[model samples]
Target: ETLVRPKPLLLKLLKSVGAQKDTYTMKEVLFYLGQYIMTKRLYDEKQQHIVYCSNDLLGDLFGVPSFSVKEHRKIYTMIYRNLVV
Candidate 1:
């Protein structure tokens, strides 16, 4: 249950960050997502905890921008939904 295959957008997203895995553990996915966020510099300046989606990928992933770090459970759900289930 902790494993996953990324679907369309997520596949593309991961590919952009050099992840070529056909399956990833939930923790691995979160790590990649965090790496993506940091590499993209998605945080809001005044509030580092808030992720500001300035690109199409993150925007499409969240369905909306400006998410709080505390709201990661919701983000997890979103990530789970975007898998090849």
Candidate 2:
């Protein structure tokens, strides 16, 4: 039987962000194509994956407006697709 695990798109995003090093920042993290943030995402040892990350707090992190649910989902999908496949 195939395990059929989901692709680590979020992890990909996080690592992509981490890889940015000096490039990723609050001004750069965004929905369209560019943005950044602090307050790093957490790792779940038991789950063996990145966990408990949310896009909502990004507004606070960046000290600006937040993405609506629809906007958030759209960008989230875009980033996942752009980075993963």
Candidate 3:
């Protein structure tokens, strides 16, 4: 039998944050949320499959070219800090 893990709570969080609408599928919702949080969906699209050490926005911030690189990290981390129960 196939293992049937339920959807991630992250999906609900994404919906609550307006990253997704009601009709969105789990896969599509996750894609949109990944794009919103990472700004490129690199994690899901390329990095996770090929790369190993994934240094997300916070790790790259101080040395990055501009402030936009850190924006989503700031947003994501802040929400994770205060929320994510």
Candidate 4:
């Protein structure tokens, strides 16, 4: 199921980072979200990245309904393939 609730820390960090009013594209939003997760050491294990679909945190952050940015996965994959070894 898609998470409809917001993480309290995410709300705090988002405000502290002054990203509350920023307008971000799907790619941009996802990029920073991942960066934030990594920088904050939120993810455990050796996993370095995350794959998000039509219903995830990105929706809560950007107010851009999940499905709206769903297609951008194509763009994300292209960038990922080019950047990964």
Top lDDT model: 1
TM-score of each: 0.84, 0.22, 0.25, 0.34
Candidate 3: tens digits of C-alpha lDDT, residues 7-73? 3554454554455344444355435544545543434444343311135442232233223324666
Residue-level lDDT of model 1, residues 4-79, one tens digit each, is 8988788778877888897988887888888888888888567888888856588787787667888868887778
Q: Residue by residue across 1-85, what tens digits does model 2's lDDT show?
A: 1111113443344445453332333223342123223334233446532233354433323233433334556545544342322
> Model 1 misses residue 59 by how many Å?
1.4
Clashes per candidate, residues 3 or more apart or on different chains: 0, 6, 0, 0
Off by over 4 Å in 3: 1-8, 39-85
lDDT of each: 0.80, 0.36, 0.40, 0.42
Give the Å shift of residue 35 in candidate 2. 16
Q: Global CA lDDT of candidate 3, please?
A: 0.40
- Which candidate model has the greater lDDT, 1 or 3? 1
Give the better candidate number (2 or 4) by lDDT. Answer: 4
lDDT of 4: 0.42
Give me the runs in candidate 4 sitting further than 4 Å from their true place. Answer: 1-21, 48-85
> Mind sharing the TM-score for model 2?
0.22
lDDT of 2: 0.36
Q: How big is the positional error of residue 35 in model 3, measured in Å on the Cα after superposition? A: 1.7
